[PDB]
Write an enzyme that holds these catalytic residues in place. Structure first.
Site, PDB file in Angstrom:
ATOM      1  N   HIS A 116      42.290  48.921  40.359  1.00 12.69           N
ATOM      2  CA  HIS A 116      42.495  50.349  40.579  1.00 12.69           C
ATOM      3  C   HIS A 116      43.334  51.154  39.588  1.00 12.69           C
ATOM      4  CE1 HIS A 116      40.726  50.581  44.753  1.00 12.69           C
ATOM      5  NE2 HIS A 116      40.631  49.311  44.416  1.00 12.69           N
ATOM      6  N   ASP A 133      42.881  57.738  45.423  1.00 14.03           N
ATOM      7  CA  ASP A 133      42.143  56.501  45.573  1.00 14.03           C
ATOM      8  C   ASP A 133      41.385  56.452  46.878  1.00 14.03           C
ATOM      9  OD1 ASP A 133      41.351  54.058  44.620  1.00 14.03           O
ATOM     10  OD2 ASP A 133      43.388  53.447  44.155  1.00 14.03           O
ATOM     11  N   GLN A 144      42.698  42.655  27.479  1.00 14.65           N
ATOM     12  CA  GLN A 144      41.301  42.152  27.492  1.00 14.65           C
ATOM     13  C   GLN A 144      40.333  43.066  26.761  1.00 14.65           C
ATOM     14  OE1 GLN A 144      39.706  40.681  31.183  1.00 14.65           O
ATOM     15  NE2 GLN A 144      38.405  42.472  31.136  1.00 14.65           N
ATOM     16  N   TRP A 163      34.331  45.200  38.591  1.00 20.39           N
ATOM     17  CA  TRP A 163      33.599  46.263  37.941  1.00 20.39           C
ATOM     18  C   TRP A 163      34.196  46.769  36.629  1.00 20.39           C
ATOM     19  CZ3 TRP A 163      28.977  46.537  37.641  1.00 20.39           C
ATOM     20  CH2 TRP A 163      28.294  47.674  37.265  1.00 20.39           C
ATOM     21  N   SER A 170      35.804  45.222  34.411  1.00 24.27           N
ATOM     22  CA  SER A 170      35.462  44.230  33.418  1.00 24.27           C
ATOM     23  C   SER A 170      34.005  44.218  32.972  1.00 24.27           C
ATOM     24  CB  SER A 170      35.889  42.861  33.910  1.00 24.27           C
ATOM     25  OG  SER A 170      37.192  42.585  33.468  1.00 24.27           O
ATOM     26  N   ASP A 222      33.698  42.549  46.152  1.00 24.17           N
ATOM     27  CA  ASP A 222      32.411  43.172  45.745  1.00 24.17           C
ATOM     28  C   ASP A 222      31.890  42.483  44.490  1.00 24.17           C
ATOM     29  OD1 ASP A 222      33.846  44.189  43.801  1.00 24.17           O
ATOM     30  OD2 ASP A 222      33.212  46.257  44.003  1.00 24.17           O
ATOM     31  N   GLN A 223      32.655  41.547  43.948  1.00 25.63           N
ATOM     32  CA  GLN A 223      32.254  40.912  42.718  1.00 25.63           C
ATOM     33  C   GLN A 223      30.869  40.283  42.724  1.00 25.63           C
ATOM     34  OE1 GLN A 223      35.608  38.336  42.256  1.00 25.63           O
ATOM     35  NE2 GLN A 223      37.011  40.039  42.487  1.00 25.63           N
TER      36      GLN A 223
HETATM   37  O1  LIG Z   1      44.575  39.641  31.223  1.00 27.82           O
HETATM   38  C1  LIG Z   1      44.006  40.652  31.635  1.00 27.82           C
HETATM   39  C2  LIG Z   1      43.324  40.781  32.890  1.00 27.82           C
HETATM   40  C3  LIG Z   1      42.746  41.949  33.212  1.00 27.82           C
HETATM   41  N1  LIG Z   1      42.782  43.044  32.380  1.00 27.82           N
HETATM   42  C4  LIG Z   1      42.137  44.317  32.756  1.00 27.82           C
HETATM   43  O2  LIG Z   1      42.400  44.597  34.115  1.00 27.82           O
HETATM   44  C5  LIG Z   1      41.225  45.212  34.714  1.00 27.82           C
HETATM   45  C6  LIG Z   1      40.660  44.282  35.758  1.00 27.82           C
HETATM   46  O3  LIG Z   1      39.590  44.959  36.461  1.00 27.82           O
HETATM   47  P1  LIG Z   1      38.427  44.081  37.127  1.00 27.82           P
HETATM   48  O4  LIG Z   1      37.715  43.316  36.063  1.00 27.82           O
HETATM   49  O5  LIG Z   1      37.615  44.955  38.026  1.00 27.82           O
HETATM   50  O6  LIG Z   1      39.258  43.043  38.027  1.00 27.82           O
HETATM   51  P2  LIG Z   1      40.077  43.193  39.399  1.00 27.82           P
HETATM   52  O7  LIG Z   1      41.277  44.052  39.167  1.00 27.82           O
HETATM   53  O8  LIG Z   1      40.273  41.843  40.002  1.00 27.82           O
HETATM   54  O9  LIG Z   1      39.004  44.011  40.266  1.00 27.82           O
HETATM   55  C7  LIG Z   1      39.181  44.411  41.599  1.00 27.82           C
HETATM   56  O10 LIG Z   1      38.721  45.743  41.745  1.00 27.82           O
HETATM   57  C8  LIG Z   1      37.348  45.908  41.337  1.00 27.82           C
HETATM   58  C9  LIG Z   1      37.040  47.384  41.420  1.00 27.82           C
HETATM   59  O11 LIG Z   1      37.213  47.875  42.747  1.00 27.82           O
HETATM   60  C10 LIG Z   1      36.457  45.058  42.235  1.00 27.82           C
HETATM   61  O12 LIG Z   1      35.100  45.189  41.819  1.00 27.82           O
HETATM   62  C11 LIG Z   1      36.892  43.604  42.178  1.00 27.82           C
HETATM   63  O13 LIG Z   1      36.127  42.816  43.090  1.00 27.82           O
HETATM   64  C12 LIG Z   1      38.375  43.476  42.493  1.00 27.82           C
HETATM   65  O14 LIG Z   1      38.826  42.133  42.338  1.00 27.82           O
HETATM   66  C13 LIG Z   1      40.297  45.503  33.526  1.00 27.82           C
HETATM   67  O15 LIG Z   1      40.684  46.713  32.887  1.00 27.82           O
HETATM   68  C14 LIG Z   1      40.616  44.310  32.623  1.00 27.82           C
HETATM   69  O16 LIG Z   1      40.201  44.457  31.280  1.00 27.82           O
HETATM   70  C15 LIG Z   1      43.416  42.996  31.153  1.00 27.82           C
HETATM   71  O17 LIG Z   1      43.464  43.954  30.392  1.00 27.82           O
HETATM   72  N2  LIG Z   1      43.999  41.790  30.853  1.00 27.82           N
END
Ligand SMILES: O=c1ccn([C@@H]2O[C@H](COP(=O)(O)OP(=O)(O)O[C@H]3O[C@H](CO)[C@@H](O)[C@H](O)[C@H]3O)[C@@H](O)[C@H]2O)c(=O)[nH]1
Ligand SMILES: O=c1ccn([C@@H]2O[C@H](COP(=O)(O)OP(=O)(O)O[C@H]3O[C@H](CO)[C@@H](O)[C@H](O)[C@H]3O)[C@@H](O)[C@H]2O)c(=O)[nH]1
Lengths: 435, 439
Positions: free
Chosen positions: B15, B103, B320, B338, B340, B359-360
């Site tokens: 988020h 949110d 990342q 999402w 990612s 939701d993954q």
């Molecule tokens: O070492 C790391 C790990 C993560 N990220 C960033 O952190 C974010 C992660 O987002 P996402 O890939 O969606 O992971 P989550 O935060 O785990 O996502 C949650 O939120 C998403 C959106 O609601 C849902 O789809 C997922 O199921 C839920 O786990 C992205 O910007 C990544 O690039 C980094 O920059 N570095």
């Protein structure tokens, strides 16, 4: 304390960007800068670039005029009518300006404001010294009937003749409003403290000297203008390409050509074998009115060139793309801002001037050895130029060893000028000191 | 003058960053921006990002709400409790906000505050259009008498049917709060001026049309969101610089830890088998960095020694988006959150999909449709069944050798590039909202 100056472009990306660059150059060199913008902007791009600039430069102040009630010329007239709105704004400035830079088209209209406030005023010219040389001589040129019909060339004193084929027709008709705009502002150069031009002496030595000898001795070759900065961040397709392998094409901040012509060029790209990144505005004059979505080139060209070419539709960061190592050539419309950036970055050019002063700018590109140019193509829409003819030029651009070597020299020279001991740099510092 | 807008994310990196990205996007585009954060933050990273972000963007402004004293879910509940704390804050604010983005979870709780203040409000949805359609249809769906678990698939109107195995059980179970959260907020979706989603139409054409049909016609597909400004450390840079282009596999299972040690070991063994060069960002996880005492008691010394030549394992947080962007990266093994997926689509990196929770799994179904990634549905939710090294190893080899995938991912990238063009829908929609957002 540090001097406060204001920069004021009237209209167009071609006018606006150089001014934004001039403002950033002034801020970097110790001045407090205000950018004056006339609203609403004709295009989304000038408005978007203005928003983008302010976020990048928090220290630079935004001054805005809301305008009271072919489009860029109409906007120039809108500013001329609403020029009185500047008066309350100038008087309000916390620390008063010691200088203001105003666009050449509104110098006559702004002349009273400069006089009442007793404010030193300069101007930044966005075109070449050679085209500007012709503009200054236009009133004396229009005195003689010799440019009406039987004229192959017009002879501006102190520089070699300009062929009449490279002069826009509207410039030679006294009845036309374009002559009136140039003729009034040229007289208005007398009250200016200096006239800044985005070119350097070794790039245009006869023209810079011709202006001084013909009534413009306060000309200051301040070029090339420095890049507006950006937070670092399509890089990937560009990044994945071998150096000097990609040809960048832009026909301007506005569309230049007919679809059939563009398609003729596109076939030429394929025959040449260049990998390309092409920025296309097939929307003619306005961002807002351009709704075409690669309807201009056809689907098959995109399918055929999908691996080796990217077509960006709309605005792109042109200067930043030019900088990238992958770029090996530029197909330019020969607007002075793009021509100067090609000079600055040492990118070889295939010149394709469609309208305005771009034909004369192309002449400078050919004279300095910066690029290849065919005078026979003419103004946009006059002639249809085929794939085979265009392709020959593209293949040459690739293979001309001399050109690449000469381009390197233009770049070296351009670099020297913006260095501490450089003429352009010395001149700007000299002006800032004048405070 | 500029419109003043505020962005409010509740909890989790998934988020927070997207909101941070939107805020930056708004700022470049003429907006005066404030970011509202709830304190204390659940994780250090959430705290780290916020503090860092403000240093990077001095112009963007921080508004902090102090909080009265599973965790990410708990925190959201807490925020709803402390929601009144905003009222003084909104009142305090000068100049007044033209609009606010809040949110999805606390849409209901903020509903009163919005109404009283006569302040236009928006959401940014951080999930896919496909998952979201499921969320918007959830309220109707529960009403349907046959309990969802018995049925093999669930049909959202105007959408490809979604298989029930792809739907988290917590969503289909009425007692669970999570159901109470989805259903409440969906209804609050009518007060909002628009709902913004980090996707574009090409990526999900059926899901976006379906959302419009199904009662969310104010949805705006604003994706992909732009990357945030960075620190640019010259420390995690050197191994990546050394490697050849497209030869390095990047692995990240989320903001949070995903899998069992036995499972991670299964994958770690498989990784050696593939022969890929790799960069793996590892997190013990559960939910919190603060509680992650253990370091490489997950993988063991021997593995590290053997792969030392061709692999790096980074424990904890990494940037990342910056890594994926690197010339070296050639594949992404992702949890398919999402944010990612979009970065991969946006940056054109081929994906092997391994979604463990929430939701993954639905997101992975999108990666498959798009041609962005390779996915095995049979793997299941995290911890359901152990997946062997050979089975994983086979998928890893495919990622390396799939030429066609390479073509499609490139096609996916182009499509992403288009949405970011000046005349593009995502830019037009955003610019229009800012224009309309004057008074
Ligand atoms: O070492 C790391 C790990 C993560 N990220 C960033 O952190 C974010 C992660 O987002 P996402 O890939 O969606 O992971 P989550 O935060 O785990 O996502 C949650 O939120 C998403 C959106 O609601 C849902 O789809 C997922 O199921 C839920 O786990 C992205 O910007 C990544 O690039 C980094 O920059 N570095
Ligand atoms: O997609 C684009 C296109 C242009 N530019 C920028 O725009 C400037 C280009 O302007 P210029 O090359 O001067 O072309 P135009 O703006 O089309 O030309 C106008 O201004 C020129 C300089 O005065 C004149 O020569 C022309 O007659 C006039 O129409 C460059 O600095 C570019 O960086 C972009 O950034 N992205």
């Amino acid at each position: 304390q540090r001097p406060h100056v204001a920069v004021f472009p009237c209209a167009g990306m071609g006018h606006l960007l150089p001014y934004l660059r001039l403002a950033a150059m002034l801020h970097s060199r110790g001045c407090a800068v205000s950018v004056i913008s006339a609203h609403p902007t004709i295009s989304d791009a000038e408005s978007r670039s203005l928003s983008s600039f302010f976020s990048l430069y928090p220290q630079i102040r935004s001054l805005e005029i809301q305008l009271l009630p072919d489009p860029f010329f109409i906007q120039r007239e809108s500013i001329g009518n609403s020029i009185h709105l500047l008066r309350p704004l100038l008087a309000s400035l916390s620390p008063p300006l010691s200088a203001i830079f105003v666009d050449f088209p509104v110098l006559t209209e702004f002349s009273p404001i400069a006089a009442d406030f007793s404010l030193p005023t300069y101007t930044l010219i966005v075109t070449s010294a050679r085209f500007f040389s012709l503009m200054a001589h236009l009133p004396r040129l229009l005195e003689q009937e010799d440019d009406i019909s039987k004229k192959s060339e017009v002879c501006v004193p102190h520089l070699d003749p300009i062929q009449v084929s490279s002069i826009p027709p509207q410039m030679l008709d006294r009845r036309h409003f374009f002559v009136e705009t140039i003729t009034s502002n040229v007289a208005s150069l007398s009250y200016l403290k200096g006239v800044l031009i985005n070119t350097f002496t070794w790039l245009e030595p006869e023209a810079v000297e011709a202006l001084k000898r013909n009534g413009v001795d306060h000309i200051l070759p301040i070029g090339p203008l420095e890049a507006i900065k950006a937070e670092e961040s399509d890089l990937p397709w560009l990044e994945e390409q071998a150096p000097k392998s990609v040809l960048f094409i832009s026909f301007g901040s506005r569309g230049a050509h007919t679809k059939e012509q563009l398609r003729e060029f596109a076939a030429a790209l394929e025959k040449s074998g260049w990998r390309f990144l092409w920025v296309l505005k097939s929307g003619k004059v306005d961002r807002e009115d351009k709704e075409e979505t690669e309807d201009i080139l056809g689907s098959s060209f995109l399918e055929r060139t999908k691996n080796r070419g990217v077509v960006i539709k709309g605005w792109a960061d042109q200067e930043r793309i030019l900088a990238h190592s992958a770029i090996g050539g530029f197909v330019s419309h020969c607007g002075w801002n793009s021509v100067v950036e090609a000079a600055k970055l040492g990118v070889p050019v295939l010149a394709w001037p469609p309208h305005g002063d771009q034909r004369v700018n192309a002449e400078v590109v050919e004279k300095v050895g910066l690029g290849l140019w065919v005078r026979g193509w003419g103004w946009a829409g006059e002639r249809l130029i085929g794939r085979d003819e265009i392709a020959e030029k593209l293949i040459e651009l690739r293979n001309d060893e001399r050109l690449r070597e000469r381009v390197k020299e233009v770049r070296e020279k351009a670099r020297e000028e913006r260095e501490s001991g450089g003429i352009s740099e010395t001149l700007i510092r000299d002006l800032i000191h004048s405070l």
